[PDB]
Design an enzyme around this catalytic site. Structure first.
Site, PDB file in Angstrom:
ATOM      1  N   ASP A  44       0.866  -1.214   0.000  1.00 19.72           N
ATOM      2  CA  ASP A  44       0.000   0.000   0.000  1.00 19.72           C
ATOM      3  C   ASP A  44       0.892   1.251   0.000  1.00 19.72           C
ATOM      4  O   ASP A  44       1.791   1.417   0.864  1.00 19.72           O
ATOM      5  CB  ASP A  44      -0.862  -0.011   1.259  1.00 19.72           C
ATOM      6  CG  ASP A  44      -1.757   1.210   1.356  1.00 19.72           C
ATOM      7  OD1 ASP A  44      -1.313   2.225   1.891  1.00 19.72           O
ATOM      8  OD2 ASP A  44      -2.922   1.139   0.899  1.00 19.72           O
ATOM      9  N   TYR A  49       2.404  10.302  -0.526  1.00 18.98           N
ATOM     10  CA  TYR A  49       3.603   9.883   0.241  1.00 18.98           C
ATOM     11  C   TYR A  49       4.867  10.199  -0.529  1.00 18.98           C
ATOM     12  O   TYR A  49       5.957  10.124   0.062  1.00 18.98           O
ATOM     13  CB  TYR A  49       3.631   8.372   0.600  1.00 18.98           C
ATOM     14  CG  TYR A  49       2.364   7.824   1.315  1.00 18.98           C
ATOM     15  CD1 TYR A  49       1.548   8.639   2.104  1.00 18.98           C
ATOM     16  CD2 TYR A  49       2.042   6.483   1.201  1.00 18.98           C
ATOM     17  CE1 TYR A  49       0.390   8.101   2.744  1.00 18.98           C
ATOM     18  CE2 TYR A  49       0.920   5.939   1.816  1.00 18.98           C
ATOM     19  CZ  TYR A  49       0.078   6.759   2.584  1.00 18.98           C
ATOM     20  OH  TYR A  49      -1.076   6.174   3.171  1.00 18.98           O
ATOM     21  N   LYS A  74      -3.308   5.815  -4.061  1.00 19.24           N
ATOM     22  CA  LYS A  74      -4.390   6.686  -3.673  1.00 19.24           C
ATOM     23  C   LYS A  74      -4.232   8.058  -4.310  1.00 19.24           C
ATOM     24  O   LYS A  74      -3.165   8.644  -4.346  1.00 19.24           O
ATOM     25  CB  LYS A  74      -4.455   6.856  -2.118  1.00 19.24           C
ATOM     26  CG  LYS A  74      -4.256   5.556  -1.325  1.00 19.24           C
ATOM     27  CD  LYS A  74      -4.461   5.833   0.187  1.00 19.24           C
ATOM     28  CE  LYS A  74      -4.086   4.582   1.021  1.00 19.24           C
ATOM     29  NZ  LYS A  74      -2.554   4.513   1.167  1.00 19.24           N
ATOM     30  N   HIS A 107      -7.987   9.368  -1.430  1.00 23.89           N
ATOM     31  CA  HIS A 107      -7.246   9.331  -0.151  1.00 23.89           C
ATOM     32  C   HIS A 107      -7.991  10.057   0.980  1.00 23.89           C
ATOM     33  O   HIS A 107      -7.924   9.665   2.139  1.00 23.89           O
ATOM     34  CB  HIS A 107      -5.868   9.980  -0.353  1.00 23.89           C
ATOM     35  CG  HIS A 107      -4.859   9.626   0.684  1.00 23.89           C
ATOM     36  ND1 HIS A 107      -3.498   9.722   0.444  1.00 23.89           N
ATOM     37  CD2 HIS A 107      -4.991   9.128   1.951  1.00 23.89           C
ATOM     38  CE1 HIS A 107      -2.841   9.338   1.523  1.00 23.89           C
ATOM     39  NE2 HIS A 107      -3.714   8.984   2.458  1.00 23.89           N
TER      40      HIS A 107
END
Length: 283
Positions: A44, A49, A74, A107
């Site tokens: 994931d 990120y 996401k 997200h």
């Protein structure tokens, strides 16, 4: 390992490994290699990120066939609208070095969620995404998204740990055929979770750590979990939870810990809306 069938028929592993924002790219990439070597097949990440490239590199280094891996990423909110979702999604695929992803999530519950969802339904129907879902949606927001659209979200990834147990939201999701998936199962160690006397005592019954007890509790509720570490020995511990079981009494003692309080913040707090929607990321 153990999987669950999502509402569109695809199988998802029950135990997954999550990456997060990291100062060092190398550590991120090595962690995903180590996680795959350890036995994880659900991996994931998220556009926000800023490590999708490292995740993609690690998959190439793993030696595991594409069809054996379940990759989630996401959509980050600067592109939560129809045309944006398609553009950022293609950027994510390029960074990941993939032709499709297994699961793509909105997200955050912010922005033009309905427009982004229509785009994601089209991307799924184009064969680029095996299942679509969301993250950090309360039941009201899930019911709203379902009422107006064609595809019901396959997964909703939300915080689940012993102080924020989602005692109602999890059954509500499951009752509507939405698969819950837990992030921050250890509350990132906050509020002395690792030393909690109840969890420690249950673990001593089975020769398992507090973390293993918590992941087993999540598993027994029928919830997919994401556990993160950059240390391979911890990963080996976290995945090794299929050799014991928690009793009814154990599950009861754990339920009693709930305060229904996020370890981080509320997505309904307008200051958090103002803060997250103001972030500018090059993704």
């Amino acid at each position: 390992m153990q999987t669950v069938k999502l509402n569109n028929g695809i199988a998802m592993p029950l135990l997954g490994f999550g990456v997060f924002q990291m100062t060092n790219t190398a550590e991120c990439e090595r962690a995903v290699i180590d996680a795959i070597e350890t036995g994880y097949r659900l991996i994931d990440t998220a556009a926000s990120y800023q490590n999708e490239t490292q995740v993609g590199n690690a998959l190439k280094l793993s030696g595991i066939a594409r069809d054996e891996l379940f990759i989630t990423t996401k959509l980050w909110l600067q592109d939560t609208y129809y045309e944006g979702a398609k553009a950022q999604f293609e950027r994510s695929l390029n960074r990941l070095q993939l032709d499709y992803v297994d699961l793509y999530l909105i997200h955050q519950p912010y922005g033009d969620v309905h427009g982004a969802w229509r785009a994601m339904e089209e991307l799924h129907q184009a064969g680029k995404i095996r299942a679509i879902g969301v993250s950090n949606f309360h039941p009201d927001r899930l019911a709203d998204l379902m009422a107006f659209n064609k595809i019901i979200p396959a997964v909703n990834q939300i915080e689940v740990n012993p102080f924020n147990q989602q005692l109602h939201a999890v059954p509500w999701m499951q009752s509507r055929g939405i698969q819950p998936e837990a992030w921050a199962p250890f509350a990132e160690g906050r509020n002395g979770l690792f030393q909690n006397p109840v969890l420690t005592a249950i673990g001593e019954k089975y020769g398992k750590s507090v973390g293993q007890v918590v992941l087993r509790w999540i598993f027994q509720r029928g919830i997919v979990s994401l556990a993160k570490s950059v240390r391979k020995g911890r990963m080996e511990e976290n995945i090794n939870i299929l050799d014991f079981e928690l009793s009814a009494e154990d599950m009861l003692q754990i339920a009693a810990l709930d305060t229904a309080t996020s370890a981080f913040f509320s997505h309904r707090d307008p200051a958090m809306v103002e803060w997250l929607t103001g972030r500018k990321l090059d993704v």
